[PDB]
Design a protein around this ligand. Sequence first.
Ligand SMILES: CC(C)=CCC/C(C)=C/CC/C(C)=C(\F)COP(=O)(O)OP(=O)(O)O
Ligand SMILES: [Mg+2]
Ligand SMILES: [Mg+2]
Ligand SMILES: [Mg+2]
Length: 530
Amino acid sequence: VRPVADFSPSLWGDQFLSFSIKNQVAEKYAKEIEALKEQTRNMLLATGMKLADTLNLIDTIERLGISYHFEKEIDDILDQIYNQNSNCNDLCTSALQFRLLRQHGFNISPEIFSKFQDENGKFKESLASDVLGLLNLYEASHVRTHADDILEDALAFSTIHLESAAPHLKSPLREQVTHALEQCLHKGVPRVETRFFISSIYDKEQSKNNVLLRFAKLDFNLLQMLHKQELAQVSRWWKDLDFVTTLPYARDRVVECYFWALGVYFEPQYSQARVMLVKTISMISIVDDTFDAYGTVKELEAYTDAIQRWDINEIDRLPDYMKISYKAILDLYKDYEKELSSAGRSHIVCHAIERMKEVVRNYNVESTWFIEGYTPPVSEYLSNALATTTYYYLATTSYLGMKSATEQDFEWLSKNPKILEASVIICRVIDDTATYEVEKSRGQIATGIECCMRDYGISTKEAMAKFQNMAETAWKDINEGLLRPTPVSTEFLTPILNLARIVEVTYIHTHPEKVLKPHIINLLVDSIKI
Ligand SMILES: CC(C)=CCC/C(C)=C/CC/C(C)=C(\F)COP(=O)(O)OP(=O)(O)O
Ligand SMILES: [Mg+2]
Ligand SMILES: [Mg+2]
Ligand SMILES: [Mg+2]
């Protein structure tokens, strides 16, 4: 006597099911991009260029979403800028220099902001009329670490004056400022912010560089073609599983899952990774629905068991419907091994597998707590709820497709590094805040905010505030974990960073779909008009 599958159908239909790439256009773009790519490189390798202009060039190339073509050129430049400790006496260039360096790992000192502060250690209110300065200070305030108390007030300071000046600014600056106030650059999904910058800002910029803009538009549209194919291939794979009918309780959200994967990494070199990642997200999506929307305490107990043993032989031990899920799961991981066979990497799949078992264990626990009406203290709660975010698992899963991933990297990840923990906390803490009303007005009395309220004996307001600071602390920890020397290559940190970004974008508020729909249309449907 299970509950009624109230979930909603995919508003996408087969819109993505079949996509065929016009090879002519694709090659036309490719050929010109190569040319524009080289012209751009020469813009970077140019000499006798001022600091402010050099930083603006790098900032622009990054916002245009094409900096992944110049990881080395950009690096060398920021490196020398870091080492020359040059001091441009104005907020705007300082804040921009600060941010760019920190996002790239260079631990530049926040002492660069003192000249802009009074002896009391607070920003000179006289700066309130320098909109560009405030904007870059604003963006910079989001990349601070625990050691940057000098910037403790930058955010509120820049925020209040930007809101103040916004209405009377010209375009596209006005739109740019308003957009930053709603979404800072450092915590947004790269593709999303890049789509917005190219279309709503740089394209309306009078001073815009025609070469860069064209480069940016063609590159974004060319990569979109690859993305669309991937989503096509993944949509078919999902179709050839037919869970939409066999497992009616499970909701169809592959398109949204793919968006998530695209948020982790968008570059072409990570095409295989993305496809693997999205299949896992979709797959684990079912397991979730299975646990808190269809299975019985006894069936879930059996399910968690079979997952731990992980062997086809356990099938018969499971109910009929759970047989579909279980076999599908083992095959998926069997496919992963096959794809990695070609490069003798099938031996890493087990890391993702162990992380999945962990997610299952905790789902099962979450169920037991639900059934018993148990409300654990914050400490015990997080000990279980952190893994149920699925973040340790997705981060691990994101390495599977990365050619450069080695055992040492997974090794490092298995020890739950700070940066990963912070990304996981952010996801848990924000989901909890956003989903407190629901669930409450439902059984789940073990929700984070509830435990927090009972544990500390504080109101919902205060509990959400406490969770808010956990997320704040978490972001600072992430920014810290990006500073050189990094425990692993930066290439393996970005996915963790991006998982945290996705959380911020998906809950910038209602249901995720209504939040993701726009982004999905903007990244996988409408191309940027040239
Ligand atoms: C915000 C979070 C937690 C995850 C985002 C990344 C995704 C899509 C992971 C796959 C599993 C999952 C939690 C869902 F599909 C959504 O279910 P739902 O979130 O309603 O299930 P619960 O987290 O409440 O059990
Ligand atoms: Mg769930
Ligand atoms: Mg659940
Ligand atoms: Mg929730």
